[PDB]
Every structure is written in structure tokens, then in C-alpha cells.
């Protein structure tokens, strides 16, 4: 089957700059009789249907604005946007129509900028949690950027990876930031056999990891 | 221009069969072909197959062998798609694709088909509060955990919509055939703990509403 790769996966852009997307195929998608390239670029909004923008990889569809243009033929396919807007926050795809079965791309998403970082969001477990027979300590990461972050759970100096439930959010529409929650659940007698719980997270904009912990007794 | 109306969300158990429709209007059904695209993992798109309604030409993907058989309706002008032997990896949103020309293809609104061996439970909520007596930040953050509900979604507001600013809603995670979520809002230190706050969760599938004061 014809497989396609996309590069890069994600990139941070500002308002008004030029965005170039690359789609590469393993085989040639050029039909020699009519010099056409069977590939089309896609665009899907969060909560809406995916729509087409560029057909035959070099021509514009009616209804698409003049900022969306495409170039390339055969193997290298390029989609160049002249000036992005605030409504251009979407995920782009490229699909070939050369041979069956049809395959899709990996997906490219654009981001915004920049410079967000958290300090402390440590919440101890409440009294209503232990009556149900379990225990749960949470760690949020609000107002942080970029989304590439590593969370680590430490219990009395020992690393524990089982029971960690991570959850990432999308980009905010007010300050262009992200939020991440990490919930470690456990049973009730394991919570009483330990005292200290350390919430560890390493960041890119800091040269030292932020350490913070709390005690049970 | 052309309308592609599909079915709504369905709650099905594992082992049954689900049928997905795609109503066509505004154009003739016996001229253009219909395709199906399965969207998994949020962003990844998978091709299911296609059907020619006039000559009964049917092709399917290698990943959908003995799973998806396509059937068209020549009298009601609509398409049908049925699945057999549903498993846990079939939780995805499915679209019907209208192959008009090689220039443009029209899409539908999508059918959310989730599958779990799962009963509708009322959500149990617990308030969260920081256990420290003092802090260095001028803001105090709070939250409440929503655990043990089915199905999606649950609308979580704060103080009956008055504290709408600075709210952060996290997506749910499936653990033991039931979803869990959380929320965090930022509160200035001039109100807490002299002024009380409340968590308002709502579940229209269970018709419950519990208020927890922090």
C-alpha cells in the first residue's frame, strides 16, 4: 500500500507569518496521460467536518481564500499559506487518490506563543474520599507552555508509575496556554503506610526541576 | 448545497451490531459513489471502504475484513453501514464521504459510537481543598473530582455560572469501564474561606444534580 509521512508534527506560529507544510509519498503519484497529481489537502476544524482546500496539489477550490496555495508534483507536496488568521487553528491532512486502498496522513497542527510556567497546584486528599475505600491525590499543571512536559510521581523517595492518570487539554483562547492534570489513585491502607508524597515535573524553560511535596501527618 | 444527515450517538453493548445511516438530499443517488472514513485517536483518519449504488461495486480495506459490509437504498436515497463483532478498539467517530468529483468531496456530521460493558451510574463528587495553612501566592486554587459516571458528558459549572472566568475543564479518561474528570478554577484570597464556593455537576442521562460546598 502507498504510505505517506508528514513533517513536522507540530510548530508554533504567530499571526501573519508564512506556514509551509510537507507531505511525502513513498511512490510517484503522477499520472502520465494528463500530468495530474492525485493528492488533495484536507482541513478539519475542532467540532466540524473535514473540508478540502487544494485539489490536484497546485490549484485552488472555489470558496477557499487566496492565502491557501499549493505546489509540488510527483513526490514532494507543499502547502504554503501566505498570511494566517485567527480562524486558521485547524488540523491539516493530505490524502492520495492514486491507488486502492486509500491512506491518510499523520496530521499537522499549528500552535501559538509563548512563555507560560506553573509553580504549585498540590491538593491533598479530602475526608470524603477515604470513606469510599480509596484514596486519590491529584496534580494539575495550569498555565504552562509548551505541551512537551514530563510528570513524575514520587512516594517517600521511591518512584511509582502504576495508577497515574494523565489528561492534557487544548490551547486556550484567552492567553494561548495549556493545562494538564495528573491523578494518582490508590487504595486506603497504602495511603496510611506512607507520609510524604512528592509531585515532580521537569520543564524546558527552567534549568532546575520544580520540587514540591506535602506531608500526611 | 448538499446535505449529509447521519444518525445520532448510540449506546451499544459489546457483541451486538450497530447500523449507521447517511441520508442524502439535493442530488441524485445513482450517479456518485459514497465512501466511509473512520476517525480514531482524535486526529488519525482510517479509510473504511466504498460502494457504487448503481452497479453494486463493493471494496473494503484489509483492516475491515469481515467487519463492514456496505448497503445502499435505491428507494429512500440513503446509505447504510453495519458493523459485526464489535470490540473495544471500535470506539471511533465515523463519517460518510460523498465522492462528487476529483476536485471536492463532501462530508457529514459524524456518528459518535462508543462501546462499553457498562451501566449508568450517578456521579460521586468530592470537594478538594489545600491542606496548607499559608501560601506565597495571592491566588488560591480549588477544585472537585468527578468519579464514577456513565455516559458522556457532564456539564461542570462554578457558582451557577457567575464564576465563569478562569475555568479549566480536563478531558475524561476511561478507567474500569467508567470515565473520570476534574476541574480547576482560580480564586483570589480575599474571599476564601470567608466566602464559600460550590461545585455544580449535572448528568442529564441520570437526572441527578448534587451541589458540594467547599
Author numbering:
A (entry chain b): 1 to 217
B (entry chain a): 1 to 214
Paper text:
The ectodomain of the S protein consists of a receptor-binding subunit termed S1 and a membrane-fusion subunit termed S2. By using a combination of biochemical, virological, and cryo-EM structural analyses, we identify three types of cross-variant neutralizing MAbs, represented by S5D2, S5G2, and S3H3, respectively, and further define their epitopes.
To investigate the molecular basis of S5D2-mediated cross-variant neutralization, we performed cryo-EM single particle analysis to determine the structures of SARS-CoV-2 B.1.351 S trimer in complex with S5D2 Fab. Three cryo-EM maps, including the SARS-CoV-2 B.1.351 S-S5D2-F1 (associated with one Fab), S-S5D2-F2 (with two Fabs), and S-S5D2-F3 (with three Fabs) states were resolved to 3.5, 3.3, and 3.5 Å resolution, respectively (Figure 4(A-F); Table S2; Supplementary Figure 8 and 9). (C and D) Side and top views of the S-S5D2-F2 cryo-EM map (C) and pseudo atomic model (D), with two up RBDs (RBD-1 and RBD-2) each bound with a S5D2 Fab. The epitope of S5D2 Fab on RBD would partially overlap with the binding sites of ACE2 on RBD, leading to clash and spatial hindrance between ACE2 and the S5D2 Fab. This is in line with the high potency of S5D2 on blocking the interaction between RBD and ACE2. However, the T478 K mutation site on the B.1.617.2 RBD is located within the binding epitope of S5D2 Fab.
